[PDB]
Design an enzyme around this catalytic site. Structure first.
Site, PDB file in Angstrom:
ATOM      1  N   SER B 214       7.271  -4.178  -2.522  1.00 33.99           N
ATOM      2  CA  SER B 214       7.212  -3.057  -3.459  1.00 33.99           C
ATOM      3  C   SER B 214       8.505  -2.964  -4.271  1.00 33.99           C
ATOM      4  CB  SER B 214       6.902  -1.745  -2.742  1.00 33.99           C
ATOM      5  OG  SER B 214       7.892  -1.446  -1.782  1.00 33.99           O
ATOM      6  N   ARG B 218       7.909  -3.459  -8.150  1.00 35.13           N
ATOM      7  CA  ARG B 218       8.075  -2.206  -8.907  1.00 35.13           C
ATOM      8  C   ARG B 218       9.152  -2.397  -9.973  1.00 35.13           C
ATOM      9  NH1 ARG B 218       9.996   0.991  -5.074  1.00 35.13           N
ATOM     10  NH2 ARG B 218       7.932   1.332  -4.350  1.00 35.13           N
ATOM     11  N   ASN B 222       8.417  -2.426 -14.018  1.00 33.18           N
ATOM     12  CA  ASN B 222       9.082  -1.527 -14.958  1.00 33.18           C
ATOM     13  C   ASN B 222       9.891  -2.303 -16.017  1.00 33.18           C
ATOM     14  OD1 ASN B 222       8.933   0.656 -12.422  1.00 33.18           O
ATOM     15  ND2 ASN B 222       9.139   1.673 -14.356  1.00 33.18           N
TER      16      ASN B 222
END
Lengths: 68, 286, 52, 83, 83, 83, 83, 83, 83, 83, 83, 83, 83, 52
Positions: B214, B218, B222
């Site tokens: 994650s 993540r 982004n």
């Protein structure tokens, strides 16, 4: 038609009688109370309490308190 | 140039590695990858990821040589505002006495901050230098280092190796398997705990593996979305159409102000999770 | 190879830069915070000391 | 080929539509608590406004990945290249 | 061709319809809290109204991208050309 | 041609139906707080009324676009001319 | 005519449905606050009822356009006339 | 005719089913605020019960139009006549 | 008529499925407000339980119409007779 | 009966899956309030539990008939005898 | 090959669209409670902010797997080649 | 045959997928109220933990039936023999 | 067969996508109430953190079965061999 | 021709953006940077007065 209202202070009584509608400034928002309302205890803001008597108007400045 | 033609070249990375016959040669297509083993390197990515890494340590070499320990000069005042903000950000998160976390936090935050700061420059400018130096107009080349999932994975997988290492080092293999099978659900009798050991294993192993995955995906998601949204707004002008080029001015003017949030948040999330995750490997959380 | 080639280069580089900075770059600058804070603290103590 | 091109239009519509739907509801939930916090503590408004932007960067993450992939599928196509 | 043209009509309905659904619910959540703040603190209304419009700009951000793409597909068409 | 015309009827149903769903829920959330505020502050109701109509213009904005595009597809279908 | 007539029945169900769903949930949200106001302050009930009907006009506005178009697609047909 | 007929059964299921869904959630929202308010004012229950029914008629208004049109489609199907 | 049959199974699944979904959420909302009042004022429980059954009749009204139509379509399918 | 038997598998999935979705949400809403009440005063737990089971019988009522007819479609399929 | 390739575009739109919808709503709920907690007890803030980012590690965990498998399907389709 | 087997994969995805959706949201609502009740009176937590496990059994009761039927359709498909 | 593997991709997207949607919303509700409890009582945080994980395992229980079944269908499809 | 006009569209947008940014968006940052330096100097002078 009316509920028994009593305004009091540690020193003396401020008002006592029968009223149709009571407007008071609660710490998280204002209240509009009429006869038969379930029990309510609340901390009051410093300000004016407005009372209604069978459909005249009074205003009193208070430095805070509690409405029960 | 067409909108698809403008986009198609810029999405490929420069790769050099082991061909079936030996450790020499550049890859030319995505299909070529299926015969190939583990042994290759992205030549564009390694140059750009290392360059700003040297610049961060260079700013510290420049700053340490001129520290007044008193009244700050015009230039070092700006550097102190950035350092005071980063020190405040670490202090508002870490209260311990670990010597590895603070230099790690400063290094990671400032490196990601400098790598993110360069995202304002045109995508077509940086590739041309590498192409002319190589003598190849068909040379694949991506400058932005944090927009490769391997950069965020290298940071999260290495930190995860320290987390797992400290957990196994102080609790032992028997204790580590105990944590992975007798928690969070537990029992006073064995027959009930045996029905819970596979459930505990399914919960703790999955949640443990989800931390590095994650973090990497993540942060990559982004940052990739950051460069991709800016690139797509640039395609309006890149289309060669009169109306679309005329229209782009209003949208571009409104859009430009947004990048400071990405610079601030993405560097901050890695720090915030790193301090906590390394602290929970020396104690019992169940 | 399309994407998988970067997995080994970054892992070695990160671990090296953190340990190198922790021993030869970070310590010389952070000491100044203990000093700068003490320059003011000694001045505040001098004010109480002179009055006493 | 027409089925791949036709289904790509719906893939783009779902990928931007679910992102828009989640974003509008998500900022309604976040922004609603910001106005309540502002009304409770008028002095904390500048601190709360900065905290709202910090949360907005996480809320609006996967939605931008979807918008980017969806716009990519309109001007370029990785499915048509597979015949 | 008819499929690409027929499916793009539904793609346009999804882009505008899901955006309309999200924006209407999002402003119901944000607006309900704004009126609550106005009844709680009537003297703060001039300030709170500006904080509401700052959130309104974030709430509609992806929705307006979706409505813009939909109008491009309804008049012009990037898929028909792909054949 | 029946598929383009038939899929247009569903596109119209989705445009108006998702807008009706969103605005009915959105005004239930917005209007609920207007009445909650009016019961607590009956003398502030003319101020709260103007503030509710300002939000009603933002809440219904994208739905007014959707119903306009839906009427356009029923009386001057742009897709039938693309085949 | 087989496809267009069959898909028009689906379009009519999605126009009355969705609108019925949103209106039923919307009056549950609006009406719940009206009863909250009527139980907090029983003396403002006559005014609160008028203010509830002002919001009820905004809540059903788009649902009534969708119901009007559904009846128009049932007892007339703008699609069958396009071939 | 078989396709028109089959799709009219789905139209009837959407038309009644989406109404069943909205009405059940709507009365869950409305009725719960009536039970909270009845307990707040045991002396006002005779009035609160009448006010609940004032909203109940608005809540079911469009649902009953849907149920009416669906019963008309199953027993006197207008689409079978190509109109 | 091979297309009509089997496709009506989707119609009955939507009629019973959407009804079950709305009724299960609706009673969660109504029931939650009943227990909330009951745990604070156990003296009102005999009255509030009767008020709950009044709402239950309105909450399930359209769901029971949907269930009846679904059983009718399962054992005495009216669409098959329309060929 | 290829189409009829394949659409029956989808009908069963909607009957059990859409019912399971409703009861899981419904019992989350009802059960959460039962724990809130048990936390308000532990002396009323024996009373509150009986009231929760009464409500649980209303919440699960349409879902238990849904799984009942779903198992009637998997065994003794009633649509394959309507051809 | 065409049905596999076209349905894979839809599978990718669903894998990511549902993740975008869930995380935007999920962070709207987590983030809204962070702003209220920080307004009610302003001295807790540095603890609350680090606790929010820890929970954010659970909120999108299963979602990042959905986005990772969607990217895999888009650029190295596993289904194509399975006949 | 291909269509009955392909539609079974979708039936299995709906059975497990809708159960997963309901169960995840349901325990989000029940568990959040277990943390709020545990904070209210830390001395009763052993009682609240066991009281939550008895409602957790009701919440998942239909979801465990759904995954049981889905695994059955995956390894011993009952529909491919009705042909 | 191309139809079975193409529908398997859709089945996988429903299995992972609905689980992603449910867990993101479910953790938005549990983690929102943990931050509210932590803000109200910082002394309780150590015990509340343990109880949040007791229910975190319950949110993911069924969604983890869904991603497990989805990866099995992507790397070892059991439906192609059913003929 | 239209190809050259694409650079003009980028150029007019960049120039007005840089002008608006440095003339109205940036000045508060210049003020915040220099005012901190002033508060530091005033603080050090007060500490130096007490020492003498």
């Amino acid at each position: 038609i009316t509920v028994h209202c009593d305004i009091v202070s540690a020193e003396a009584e401020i008002f006592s009688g029968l009223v149709e509608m009571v407007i008071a400034h609660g710490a998280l928002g204002d209240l509009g109370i009429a006869p038969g309302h379930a029990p309510l205890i609340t901390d009051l803001k410093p300000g004016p309490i407005r009372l209604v008597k069978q459909g005249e108007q009074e205003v009193y400045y208070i430095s805070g308190g509690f409405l029960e | 140039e067409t909108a698809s033609g403008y986009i198609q070249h810029h999405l490929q990375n420069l790769t050099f590695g082991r061909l079936p016959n030996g450790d020499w040669g550049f890859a030319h297509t995505a299909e070529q990858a299926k015969e190939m083993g583990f042994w290759a390197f992205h030549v564009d990515t390694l140059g750009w990821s290392v360059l700003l890494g040297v610049v961060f340590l260079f700013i510290f070499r420049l700053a340490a040589k001129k520290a007044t320990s008193g009244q700050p000069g015009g230039l070092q005042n700006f550097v102190e505002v950035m350092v005071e903000f980063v020190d405040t950000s670490v202090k508002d998160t870490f209260h311990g006495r670990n010597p590895l976390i603070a230099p790690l936090a400063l290094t990671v935050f400032v490196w990601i901050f400098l790598l993110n700061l360069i995202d304002l420059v045109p995508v077509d400018y940086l590739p041309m230098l590498a192409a002319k130096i190589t003598g190849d107009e068909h040379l694949f080349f991506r400058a932005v280092a944090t927009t490769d999932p391997n950069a965020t994975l290298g940071l999260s997988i290495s930190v995860f190796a320290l987390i797992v290492f400290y957990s196994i080092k102080v609790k032992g293999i028997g204790g580590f398997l105990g944590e992975l099978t007798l928690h969070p659900f537990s029992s006073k009798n064995i027959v009930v705990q045996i029905l819970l050991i596979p459930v505990n294993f399914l919960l703790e192993f999955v949640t443990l593996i989800a931390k590095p995955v994650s973090l990497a995906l993540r942060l990559f998601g982004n940052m990739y979305a950051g460069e991709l949204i800016f690139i797509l707004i640039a395609v309006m002008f890149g289309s060669g159409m009169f109306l679309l080029s005329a229209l782009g001015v209003a949208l571009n003017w409104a859009w430009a102000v947004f990048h400071i949030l990405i610079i601030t948040l993405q560097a901050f999330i890695f720090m915030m999770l790193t301090i906590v995750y390394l602290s929970m490997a020396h104690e019992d959380n169940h | 190879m399309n994407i998988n080639a970067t997995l080994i280069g970054q892992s070695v580089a990160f671990f090296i830069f953190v340990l190198f900075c922790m021993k030869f770059v970070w310590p010389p600058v952070i000491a100044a915070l203990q000093e700068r804070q003490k320059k003011i603290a000694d001045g505040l103590d001098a004010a109480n000391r002179a009055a006493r | 080929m027409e089925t791949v091109v036709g289904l790509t239009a719906i893939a783009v519509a779902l990928l931007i539509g679910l992102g828009a739907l989640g974003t509008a509801i998500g900022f309604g939930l976040l922004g609603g608590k910001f106005l309540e916090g502002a009304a409770r503590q008028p002095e904390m408004v500048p601190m709360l406004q900065v905290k709202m932007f910090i949360v907005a960067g996480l809320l609006d993450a996967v939605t931008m990945i979807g918008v980017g992939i969806a716009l990519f599928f309109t001007f370029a196509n990785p499915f048509v290249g597979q015949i």
